[PDB]
Each structure stands twice: as C-alpha cells, then as structure tokens.
Design a protein around this ligand. Structure first.
Ligand SMILES: C[C@@]1(C(=O)Nc2nncn2C2CC2)CCOc2ccccc21
Ligand SMILES: C[C@@]1(C(=O)Nc2nncn2C2CC2)CCOc2ccccc21
Lengths: 304, 304
C-alpha cells in the first residue's frame, strides 16, 4: 500500500533526448527514427520572439545551421521542415534506441510524465496534468524547451507534449508532437493570459477512491447526492462538471471499494463545503486532481 | 520557473532491475557487475515470516534454487551469500548496462528516488525522504520488495535503499545496499511500530526558499527569530531542531534570495502558529519537507 505522485520510468525517453542548437539558441530535441523534433522557436533570437515570422526566419536557415548532438556525437542533418510550431530535422541515422511510439493529443484532465531536459540531458522526471485551461504547471527553466511529456503502455511510448513556453504567470504551454499548441497559446513573447484553472473533478474522485483503498477513510460520510446536485456545488467551487461518462470511468474503483460513485460525490461535496479542518488525505491538505481514474487503477494493481 | 516533486531520470536504474524467484516467492533484484542484490526474505514462505531463522532457512537453498531473470533471459547463479538482510547472488555474466555506482547509507531527512518494480519490471518512479523515524512513505504492493532508492551525481548512481517491508501502519522499511535496515526494523512479520514522524525543518526552509525564487512570497513577514527561539516553536510542532549546520547548508539559498536564514525561520514560525488560512505555497496546503536544500539548488539551476 501507499499512494504516490508517480511518473513513468523515463529510460525509454532518455534514449531519445538530443541537443539542438540554432545560432545562439540551444534547446532539446526528440530523436525518433531518423527525425529530430524540436520547438520552431529554436530559430529565434530573444528579439525575434516579440513578433516572429517563422516562415521568413526559416528561409535564412539551411540543414547545416541546425546542430544536433546525441550525447557527445554529432548527427548529420539532411532535411528540415516546419509542421505547425515544431521543426522536424531529418538526420542520416535512425536512433538505435527508438522505442515503439505513438504521437497522441491528450484531453484536459489527462496526466503524463515530463522528462525535464537541459542541453539534451535529462535532469528529472515528474508527473503533470493537462489543466482544463490547456496549461501545465511544470518545472521548466531556460534551455528546457523541447522536453517532452509522455505516457507508456507496456513498451509503447505515447508522446503527448513538447514544452515551448512559460506564460508571464509562471504556468507552462506547449504542443502535441504534431506541433499544435494545447489551448489558444502561440509561440510569441506577448501578453497571453490563461483562463480559469478549474479542478478536474473526476480525478479528485479517483484520488478519493485511492485514499479509501490505502486506508484514509475519515472523509466518508452518510450522504449521497445526484449528478445535478453535485454539479451545482462543483460550479460554485470552480470544479469541472461531472458527466455520466466520468461516473462510468469510475465504475471499476466504485466496484473495488463498494462505495457508489454518487456517495463519493457526496463525500466530495461535504469536503468542498466544510474544508479539511486541518486533516489530510494521502498526506495532502488539498484535494488532489492530478491522478486520473486509470492512474489510480494502474498504481493500485502494480502495472509495469 | 515552477517547482515540482521531481525524481531522478530512472534509465540507469531500469537497466539493473531483474526478477528473483525462490520457491513460490518472487521479488526484485538489483544486478550490478556480476552480483544480484535482493532482500533475504525471498527465501521465506508467508508462514516463515512470523519467526524466520534466516541462516537455517538458507542452508536448504542451493545456487540453482535462486531463479534470476533479466528481461526474458535467465542468469546463471554461481554463488550466493547473505550480508545482513540482503542476499548477494553471484551470476556468471556482468550486467552490460551497469552504471558507475556507489552504495551509500543516507541520514534521516535525505531524499531519494524510488523505481518501484514488480517481477523485475519498472512500474514508476517517485521522490521519497528517509523520515526522521527511519521509515519512508512509499507506494509498494506485494512483489515490490527489492525495488531500490537512489540519487545520481551526473553519471554515478548512489544506491541508498532497498525495499523490504510494510509496517502494519502502512509505512515502509528497508535497508541500505549492505543489507542494514534503516532504523530499528527487522525483516520479520511482527509488531513493529514506528516512532514520531517529525517534520524535517531544514527541508521546509529549503522549500520556502524555492517558493520565494518561484514567486510565492505571501508568507514573508517583518520578523526575525533566533535558533533557540525558533527551536522552542519547532519542538511544540514536532519539527526537527534546527542546528547551525542546517543554517550553513541553507547559506546559498539565503544568498540567492537575500532573505537571511533566521528571517525565513520567523516566517516558518508564524506559518506554524497561524496556519495557511486557506492559502497555498507552491500548490501545497501543507509545509513540504521532502526537498533538501541540495534538491532546491539542483532544480532551481537545472543540473543534469
Ligand atoms: C523561450 C521563451 C520561454 O518561455 N522559455 C521557457 N519555457 N519554459 C521556461 N522558459 C524560460 C523562461 C524560463 C522565452 C520567453 O519568450 C518566449 C515566448 C514564446 C515561447 C518561448 C519563449
Ligand atoms: C513480504 C512482507 C511485506 O511487508 N511486503 C511488502 N513490502 N511493501 C509492501 N509489501 C506488501 C504487503 C503489501 C509481507 C508481510 O510480512 C513481511 C515481514 C517482513 C518483511 C516483509 C514482509
């Protein structure tokens, strides 16, 4: 037992991190097969970021201007193209460590692991969620752009995120591996404010189920509620509305614990209305929303 | 910017995980050079755990009774010995993926990453701290024994922990890689209760410095305190006493932020006495103590 904010093992993704340099700018690239993926802002100076015309800035770049280094060995760049906000650099060598992989675009509320990198080298791994306002709250310093977010299904790495930007509020923005930004964000040094960061209700309920499985039961009460009644409270507390799809997804956790989904909603409702009163749930003093119901099942069963 | 509970990249340790089976019991082993390290309780039945005589149980075991599998390939066991609470299985093949490594015994308050494993396969990675009562609060199910805790200094993995046990309270106990338990715990299914789980004061102060660096400054006040005055409050709140050694260790964070160590102690004192009042610091509603001052510097500078 015990329940932790766990990230996927990062080895398969570490084998893909390379360093990409264009002019004075160095960031991270993802090397899969004979292609290196990186944020297109690698071609910009700090001055260009205010109002970059990426197509025009890219005409001045040739294959030899993109320096790609995998560990301490240089990769030969034989092609380059821009797909949305990422550059795809064709190299003459397939990455020998390329794992089985997919490029997926996740939904808000979904979680993933980030392998934070600097100069193509991994610094650490942590678990994130795509917020309902399409930002992530990561740990990213200068040089961390090009670090990726991913999930793993046994031996297949599903890449879902590539880091590009830090908003003036300290939150993070990026793209899927096709270069499309999550949310309305653009790769330009301009006023971009995030919308309401609501709480991922289905994730909190999944985490309440993990708490019951792992022995933290104080918050369980004698009440029940309905989806409509719960959602009035959820609205008031800036929580995502709960749908019948969410109830269905929580079905296995409900079955394993014997606590009906709406009963757990009534427990959550009282926690919202009354607070924790100085108590904790799974070592946290706030309601955690960065575990999906699939993460809870995975961790509570021991999936590898 | 942004600050996260970050674990080290696990690739180097994933390359060392093997499966060890003895009789009906399967757990994890750590393969470094031509030795596989695992908890000695691999030789026990569930019945043996009540009062095992490890030397006597081990006489009935031969090299061929320890089945070691690295991925899907069997390793030939050519020697076996017991060192304290671990077994060292000599195999005929050096692990080709053995990283540069050390075996270190950490102090309470120190943090490390755990690569939770099942049947020699990695399931996830998370950051831990050796609690002041010598327990860890991990996420460990049946079959996770033999999973290891570690730190990394560039390319050198310092192994500090091997998982062995779950106490009836849901907390975890284990050994360093020489097989010596942290704390007073023994590998026997018996009444073992942990002592006071105090808060690692120097870690909380380090995390308050990370919060100021990353923009969360509301808790900064107009006060100062002394070590002796701070420690009276720390005692009342079950916090570890702060020593001049801790003040010295926080020196670089104090320098970087311009906030004297004792001023931050006065901020911590008011947080203890007054609570958070429904506010958060780095997305947490409790004072976090699982970041050392070295972890804060590492993450805030981008060490790889
Ligand atoms: C490259 C840059 C950026 O945000 N980098 C970044 N990302 N996460 C963290 N950091 C560092 C600031 C800490 C700089 C600001 O202008 C922009 C504008 C758009 C896209 C990127 C960027
Ligand atoms: C093997 C065992 C154990 O605690 N295993 C373990 N460790 N972390 C998690 N789990 C599973 C229980 C979930 C079982 C109980 O008796 C003992 C007694 C001593 C040492 C080990 C053990």
């Amino acid at each position: 037992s015990g329940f932790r904010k766990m990230a996927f093992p990062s080895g398969k993704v570490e084998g893909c991190m390379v360093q990409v340099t264009c002019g004075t700018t160095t960031l991270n690239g993802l090397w899969l097969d004979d292609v290196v993926y990186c944020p297109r802002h690698v071609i910009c100076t700090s001055e260009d970021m205010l109002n970059p015309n990426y197509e025009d800035l890219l005409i001045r770049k040739s294959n030899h201007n993109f320096l790609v280094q995998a560990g301490n060995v240089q990769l030969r760049v034989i092609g380059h193209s821009m797909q949305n906000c990422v550059l795809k650099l064709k190299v003459d060598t397939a990455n020998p460590k390329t794992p089985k992989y997919k490029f997926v675009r996740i939904q808000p509320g979904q979680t993933f692991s980030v392998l934070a990198c600097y100069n193509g080298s991994p610094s650490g791994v942590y678990q994130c969620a795509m917020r309902p306002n399409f930002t992530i709250k990561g740990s990213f310093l200068n040089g961390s752009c090009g670090s990726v977010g991913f999930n793993i299904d046994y031996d297949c790495v599903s890449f879902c995120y590539m880091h590009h930007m830090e908003l003036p509020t300290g939150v993070h923005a990026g793209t899927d591996l096709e270069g499309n930004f999550y949310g309305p964000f653009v790769d330009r040094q301009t006023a971009q404010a995030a919308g309401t960061d609501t709480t991922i209700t289905v994730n909190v309920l999944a985490w309440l189920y993990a708490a019951v499985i792992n022995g933290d039961r104080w918050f369980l009460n004698r009440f029940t509620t309905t989806l409509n009644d719960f959602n009035l409270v959820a609205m008031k507390y800036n929580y995502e509305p709960l749908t019948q799809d969410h109830v269905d997804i929580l079905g296995p956790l409900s079955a394993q614990t014997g606590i009906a989904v709406l009963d757990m909603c009534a427990s959550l409702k009282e926690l919202l209305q009354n607070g924790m009163n100085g108590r904790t749930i799974l070592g946290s003093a706030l309601l955690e929303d960065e575990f999906t119901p699939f993460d809870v099942v995975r961790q509570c069963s021991g999936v590898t």
